Design an enzyme around this catalytic site. Structure first.
Site, PDB file in Angstrom:
ATOM      1  N   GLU A 128       0.880  -1.134  -0.151  1.00 19.95           N
ATOM      2  CA  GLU A 128       0.180   0.140   0.038  1.00 19.95           C
ATOM      3  C   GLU A 128       0.842   1.111   0.198  1.00 19.95           C
ATOM      4  OE1 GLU A 128      -2.843   0.090   3.144  1.00 19.95           O
ATOM      5  OE2 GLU A 128      -2.985   2.340   2.988  1.00 19.95           O
ATOM      6  N   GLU A 133      -3.796  11.185   2.889  1.00 17.88           N
ATOM      7  CA  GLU A 133      -4.659  10.288   4.031  1.00 17.88           C
ATOM      8  C   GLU A 133      -4.420  11.245   5.251  1.00 17.88           C
ATOM      9  OE1 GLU A 133      -3.066   6.975   6.506  1.00 17.88           O
ATOM     10  OE2 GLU A 133      -4.922   6.227   5.956  1.00 17.88           O
TER      11      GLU A 133
END
Ligand code: NA
Ligand code: NA
EC number: 3.2.1.81
Length: 277
Positions: A128, A133
């Site tokens: 990932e 974020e």
């Protein structure tokens, strides 16, 4: 014309190379209503995730909580009636990307404790990269998070489950000017150069380099391969366990507020470094 015309790519493609636009790039200048979307939407995207999982924490990803309108992708949120769950938007690319590639979004975080995300995951959920974020909430007592972008990546072992990400202080980026990222559109990009080298860029400037096995995968979860698997682009919100397990999750009043409950993406764009003709 594209919304990103004239906005340079800040990474270096290498001597004798140039950045070539990858066709997944989308500036969302079409109408794709929540239910049914549009032909153009489906040329690149699917609703949901890389697989049928409906998400972390109190999340339940829901197709009618994403839509494209007014030049923006909208990822919205709402209470799942009669439960403590949160319906959230999510879209995923139909095809994955591989290094070397520059991957960038221009986006305005939702004003929520939820994660507003632009991120990448391998088909097997072991590798990932997190580009956007961040947690936009203007709640009193959340000011620290409102001034930060989480710049990170994960490597996993699925069973028994193990999760590594970098955790040094620089993995939470602030500009030193008190900027609350939720207040405007910002562009955040990563140069995924090779399996051992990531560069993070905020509004056209290099802010963090994550390079070498000791920071990419010191525990050996990738078996010496690094961040190498093809990864799908994902744009979502998440109610994440580290927040909601521990008492931070949206209220009904927040979820009902149309001025807070939506994360907007002006564009996602991707470039490959290629020899100059
Ligand atoms: Na790998
Ligand atoms: Na746009």
């Amino acid at each position: 014309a594209a919304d990103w015309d004239g906005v340079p790519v800040p990474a270096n493609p290498g001597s004798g190379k140039t950045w070539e636009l990858h066709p997944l790039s989308d500036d969302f200048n079409y109408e794709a209503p929540a239910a049914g979307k549009s032909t153009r939407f489906y040329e690149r995207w699917k609703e949901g995730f890389i697989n049928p999982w409906t998400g972390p924490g109190l999340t339940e990803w829901h197709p009618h909580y994403s839509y494209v309108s007014g030049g923006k992708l909208a990822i919205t949120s709402g209470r799942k009636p009669g439960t403590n769950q949160v319906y959230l938007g999510s879209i995923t690319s139909k095809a994955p990307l591989t290094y070397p590639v520059y991957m960038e979004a221009r986006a305005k975080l939702s004003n929520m404790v939820l994660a507003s995300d632009f991120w990448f995951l391998s088909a097997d959920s072991t590798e990932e990269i997190d580009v956007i974020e961040a947690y936009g909430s203007d709640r009193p007592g959340q000011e620290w998070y409102a001034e930060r972008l989480h710049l990170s990546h994960h490597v996993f072992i699925r069973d028994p489950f193990q999760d590594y990400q970098p955790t040094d202080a620089g993995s939470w980026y602030a500009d030193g000017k008190g900027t609350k990222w939720r207040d405007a559109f910002h562009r955040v990009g990563v140069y995924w150069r090779d399996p051992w080298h990531l560069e993070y860029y905020v509004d056209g400037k290099l802010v963090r380099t994550v390079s070498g096995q000791d920071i990419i995968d010191p525990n050996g979860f990738t078996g010496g391969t690094g961040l190498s698997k093809p990864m799908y682009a994902i744009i979502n919100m998440e109610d994440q366990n580290w927040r909601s397990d521990n008492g931070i999750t949206p209220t009904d009043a927040e979820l009902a507020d149309p001025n807070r409950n939506t994360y907007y993406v002006d564009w996602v764009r991707f470039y490959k470094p290629v020899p100059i003709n």
